[PDB]
């Protein structure tokens, strides 16, 4: 089997991407944030505290003839940005782009933190990291991809995120019309539960490539590109007036600037992020100070190849017995 679904930016800055997902019988369609950095499929629901729902579409398990309460199971998750959610668990039928899993754990939120409430466009998350990170207790549950893998034509999914435009998540096949050149595959460590790999270095604009190993994670659920402070300083030094602002929380730059590109290495191959992809717009409405899309990972503990990086590539998440990642230009 295969599936194919369009993923769409939630706003004009590509702050996140949403993908429609059918849950239950009859189908209830929710727009979920596909997140290769976590492993829980959770939704706003009829059980979510009413004051914490503000415009999201909710899953109502009592209206699904295939929903079954997973007795005794709870979940609770905290994300790197400080947001969180928790609740109980149903199993139900879940379809993405024509690909159907029966018995998928659907984690129904009883509580969500304020940033989720405040984002009316995201109805939940669909985790695509490794199932070892799933938070369901006392019986850990599998991701959608893990449940579908055996049925897929090939045990892979691909992310093709657009810049200020829709893109595509495919399951079970590699669309050879969606990229240029070849796909370069690189080793993955699953020891932390992430799609963790080592970039071979970087360049800033037309500058010379620096060969240096950068361990990090391919994370569709993180908006920006978080890299070591040395790398980030070298980038922003090429932008007149750019500075790190402790009060704003990262590098900012004059909105009048034209940003240089940023290149990262995948083995001997190179992925070029155009300068425009690194502009996240005014820090507050009407400001002439703009927020940068490349930020330091120094306070995270891990480097994160988020959407800023991934949207410049066609990315293969290869879930073969030994997982790997593939990157192509597009």
Curated annotation (Swiss-Prot):
Active-site residues (renumbered): 35, 199
GO molecular function, one term: aspartic-type endopeptidase activity
E.C. code: 3.4.23.22
Domain Peptidase A1 intervals: 17-328
Keywords associated with the record: Aspartyl protease, Disulfide bond, Hydrolase, Protease, Signal, Zymogen
Domain of life according to the entry: Eukaryota
Catalytic reaction equation(s): Hydrolysis of proteins with specificity similar to that of pepsin A, prefers hydrophobic residues at P1 and P1', but does not cleave 14-Ala-|-Leu-15 in the B chain of insulin or Z-Glu-Tyr. Clots milk
Family membership: Belongs to the peptidase A1 family.
Protein name per the record: Endothiapepsin
Organism this protein belongs to: Cryphonectria parasitica
Residues of the whole record sequence present: 90 to 419 of 419
């Amino acid at each position: 089997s295969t599936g194919s679904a369009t993923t769409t930016p939630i706003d004009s800055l590509d702050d996140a991407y949403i993908t429609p997902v059918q849950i239950g019988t009859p189908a209830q369609t929710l727009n979920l944030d596909f997140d290769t950095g976590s492993s829980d499929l959770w939704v706003f629901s009829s059980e979510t505290t009413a004051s914490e729902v503000d415009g999201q579409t909710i899953y109502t398990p009592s209206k699904s003839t295939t929903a079954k309460l997973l007795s005794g199971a709870t979940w609770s998750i905290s994300y790197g940005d400080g947001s969180s959610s928790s609740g109980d668990v149903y199993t139900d039928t879940v379809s993405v782009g024509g690909l159907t899993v029966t018995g998928q754990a659907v984690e129904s939120a009883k509580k969500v933190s304020s940033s989720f409430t405040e984002d009316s466009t995201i109805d939940g998350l669909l985790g695509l990291a490794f199932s070892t990170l799933n938070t369901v207790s006392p019986t850990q549950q599998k991701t959608f991809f893990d449940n579908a893998k055996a049925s897929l034509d090939s045990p892979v999914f691909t992310a093709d995120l657009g810049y200020h435009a829709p893109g595509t998540y495919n399951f079970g096949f590699i669309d050879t019309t969606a990229y240029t050149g070849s796909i370069t595959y690189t080793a993955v460590s699953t020891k932390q539960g992430f799609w963790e790999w080592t970039s071979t270095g970087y360049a800033v604009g037309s500058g010379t490539f620096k060969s240096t190993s950068i361990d990090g994670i391919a994370d569709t659920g993180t908006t920006l590109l978080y890299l070591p402070a040395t790398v980030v300083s070298a980038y922003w030094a090429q932008v007149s007036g750019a500075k790190s602002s402790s009060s704003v929380g990262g590098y900012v730059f004059p909105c009048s600037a034209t940003l240089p590109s940023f290149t990262f290495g995948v083995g001997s191959a190179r992925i070029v992020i155009p300068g425009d992809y690194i502009d996240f717009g005014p820090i507050s409405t009407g400001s002439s100070s703009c927020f940068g899309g490349i930020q330091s990972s120094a306070g995270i503990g891990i480097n994160i190849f988020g959407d800023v990086a991934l949207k410049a590539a066609f990315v293969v998440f290869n879930g073969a017995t030994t997982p790997t990642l593939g990157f192509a230009s597009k």
